[PDB]
Design a protein around this ligand. Sequence first.
Ligand SMILES: Cc1ccc(C2CC2)c(-c2cc(F)c3c(c2C)CCCO3)c1[C@H](OC1CC1)C(=O)O
Ligand SMILES: Cc1ccc(C2CC2)c(-c2cc(F)c3c(c2C)CCCO3)c1[C@H](OC1CC1)C(=O)O
Ligand SMILES: [Cl-]
Ligand SMILES: [Mg+2]
Ligand SMILES: [Mg+2]
Lengths: 51, 144, 143, 50
Amino acid sequence: QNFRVYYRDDPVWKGPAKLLEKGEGAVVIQDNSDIKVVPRRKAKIIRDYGK
Amino acid sequence: DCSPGIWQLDCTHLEGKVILVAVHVASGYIEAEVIPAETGQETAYFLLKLAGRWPVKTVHTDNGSNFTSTTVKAACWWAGIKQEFSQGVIESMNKELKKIIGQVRDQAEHLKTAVQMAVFIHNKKRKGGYSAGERIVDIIATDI
Amino acid sequence: CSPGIWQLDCTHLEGKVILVAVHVASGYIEAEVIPAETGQETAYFLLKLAGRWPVKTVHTDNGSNFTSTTVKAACWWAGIKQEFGVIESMNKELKKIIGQVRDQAEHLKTAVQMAVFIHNKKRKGYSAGERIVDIIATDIQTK
Amino acid sequence: NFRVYYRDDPVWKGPAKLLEKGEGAVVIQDNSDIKVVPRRKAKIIRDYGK
Ligand SMILES: Cc1ccc(C2CC2)c(-c2cc(F)c3c(c2C)CCCO3)c1[C@H](OC1CC1)C(=O)O
Ligand SMILES: Cc1ccc(C2CC2)c(-c2cc(F)c3c(c2C)CCCO3)c1[C@H](OC1CC1)C(=O)O
Ligand SMILES: [Cl-]
Ligand SMILES: [Mg+2]
Ligand SMILES: [Mg+2]
């Protein structure tokens, strides 16, 4: 059970990024070595459902 | 971690339209769709459908921008598919598919109809002596 | 015989038309969001289905897309016999899963294929995807 | 072996028996009637998957 985050800053989707924390309004992620705070609506948190 | 789960995907083109083709390398079985644009979104959607049908473990593609896109990464992550970027199989299959399409093209108005007739023809043809469509089902069931 | 028997039906979500095929003996499903509930779209779906599985008999209700000449043409070319509550149960199950995953995707069609994947891979002890492959391979291997 | 579907009315009619396929028109028989239909209004389909 692990997660990667795909997100938009630019309508192009970025990712995968590491999920650092999830809140009711935002997700904190690390893409490469930059930490970013991303509104929930602009992020998809996707698990490796199919293994 | 062997041949039952390994697929190759590539795009070919006819009549200005984009055809996305998947081949199960060990059987020669194929699936194809005419997609409206050669984008990550259309490729990811194709892959989710494919992964729901078969136990897709590895997909081998070239470096076309739709295959290296973020949207396809997301699809493979969710579905559990490893991407890798026996040799030249899909390129040979593209040619064979276009050959069959040309043989039946005048039997349908729409290119997509002839594409799917061609897929059917290829998958059902017994080489002896099983067909590609029989070979994939036999390979996967034995791997269960 | 059970290897070749399928049921097809349309269901509706978000004003979109979902065409569902169920392999009766396994519970395996495939589905597509089609732009209109027409014979042309139904026939194209059947041609794709018949190219991947040994489709011998298809059971449907009497919806006009299923009784259309275009679908009769598909079934004649592909060698399919047409007959006129497995699929209905399956429509409800598919919609339940779709509802559970709907906010994970922008597009309804994405959620539909996620739900198909979820349904087909779930081990209830084999999954529907394992069962269809096993049923059909047994028929092939025993001639 | 072959079926011809054809239009006159947007619904596809047939199947009819194929008698001759020309490049401009098709001669068919549908319920005792001999009909000549333009190629563009005809679909000639074989029971490939029998
Ligand atoms: C439009 C869009 C844009 C960006 C993405 C990805 C990078 C974030 C996706 C997408 C693609 C997936 F394959 C996928 C998922 C998503 C969310 C979720 C898990 C199952 O696999 C989609 C997706 O549509 C695409 C035709 C599939 C949608 O409907 O949201
Ligand atoms: C547009 C149209 C109109 C009428 C028909 C039928 C009554 C004559 C067909 C049709 C349907 C088939 F299922 C089919 C074939 C044809 C020709 C050829 C052999 C394999 O199966 C089509 C067909 O498109 C439909 C989405 C498939 C096309 O592209 O020509
Ligand atoms: Cl927050
Ligand atoms: Mg290529
Ligand atoms: Mg119905």
